[PDB]
Enzyme design. Structure first.
Site, PDB file in Angstrom:
ATOM      1  N   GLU A  65      34.558  67.362  71.933  1.00 21.54           N
ATOM      2  CA  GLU A  65      35.492  67.093  70.845  1.00 21.54           C
ATOM      3  C   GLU A  65      36.502  68.233  70.690  1.00 21.54           C
ATOM      4  O   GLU A  65      36.208  69.399  70.963  1.00 21.54           O
ATOM      5  CB  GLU A  65      34.697  66.884  69.544  1.00 21.54           C
ATOM      6  CG  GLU A  65      35.550  66.655  68.304  1.00 21.54           C
ATOM      7  CD  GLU A  65      36.421  65.424  68.456  1.00 21.54           C
ATOM      8  OE1 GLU A  65      35.971  64.327  68.071  1.00 21.54           O
ATOM      9  OE2 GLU A  65      37.556  65.553  68.984  1.00 21.54           O
ATOM     10  N   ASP A  93      30.891  63.804  71.778  1.00 14.18           N
ATOM     11  CA  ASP A  93      31.338  64.993  71.061  1.00 14.18           C
ATOM     12  C   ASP A  93      30.782  66.278  71.647  1.00 14.18           C
ATOM     13  O   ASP A  93      31.491  67.291  71.677  1.00 14.18           O
ATOM     14  CB  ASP A  93      30.944  64.911  69.590  1.00 14.18           C
ATOM     15  CG  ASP A  93      31.691  63.814  68.866  1.00 14.18           C
ATOM     16  OD1 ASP A  93      32.870  63.620  69.224  1.00 14.18           O
ATOM     17  OD2 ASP A  93      31.109  63.167  67.955  1.00 14.18           O
TER      18      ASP A  93
HETATM   19 MN    MN Z   1      36.297  62.065  67.967  1.00 14.00          MN
END
Ligand code: MN
Ligand code: MN
Length: 181
Positions: A65, A93
């Site tokens: 992320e 992420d």
């Molecule tokens: Mn995202």
């Protein structure tokens, strides 16, 4: 009671690196933070939680992320080639080098079990771990495996509670909570 601006709040609440990464994310997606400002706040919040999750065990997680999408996929594919991990269908992420799995971090103003079920239906993976946080302390994770210990997750939950409290003080929480899709 005065009703503040969400953009004011975001620029005062999150550190400048997070704000800049959120700006770049919205530019990449063709969104205008000046208009979709609840979403700006949500993107900042999710970035902060991902960074805190990684910082809870430094060196254990690769952060996906925050990167631009092309670079993010380059990092995912590199991890997959190096570790043999299966390639995810949607950008996750984090990657957990200890448990050898990608992680989707969710932060929601909706009910965490429903949000969890929605995310699991979206990514359609038997390997990627999902961890959902709310702003009121509830959480939900794949196979009831919460990855980090109680102290680490309490730090994240306290940050989220603080954000909700400061939003409410400025009259921003009602709209922020209602606007999630
Ligand atoms: Mn995202
Ligand atoms: Mn989320």
């Amino acid at each position: 009671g005065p009703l503040g601006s969400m953009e004011d709040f975001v620029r005062q609440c999150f550190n400048p690196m997070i704000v800049e990464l959120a700006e770049k994310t919205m530019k990449e997606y063709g969104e205008d933070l000046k208009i979709e400002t609840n979403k700006f706040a949500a993107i900042c919040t999710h970035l902060e939680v991902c960074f805190m999750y990684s910082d809870a065990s430094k060196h254990r997680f690769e952060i996906i992320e925050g990167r631009d999408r092309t670079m993010a996929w380059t990092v995912v594919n590199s991890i997959c080639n190096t570790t043999g991990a299966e390639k995810p269908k949607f950008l996750p992420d984090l990657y957990d080098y200890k448990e050898n799995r990608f992680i989707e971090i969710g932060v929601t103003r909706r009910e965490v079990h429903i949000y969890y079920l929605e995310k699991a239906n979206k990514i359609k993976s038997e390997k990627t771990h999902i961890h959902i946080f709310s702003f009121t302390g509830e959480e939900m994770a794949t196979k009831a495996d919460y990855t980090l210990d109680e102290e680490s997750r309490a730090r994240i939950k306290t940050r989220l509670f603080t954000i909700r409290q400061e939003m409410a003080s400025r009259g921003l929480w009602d709209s922020f909570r209602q606007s999630e899709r």
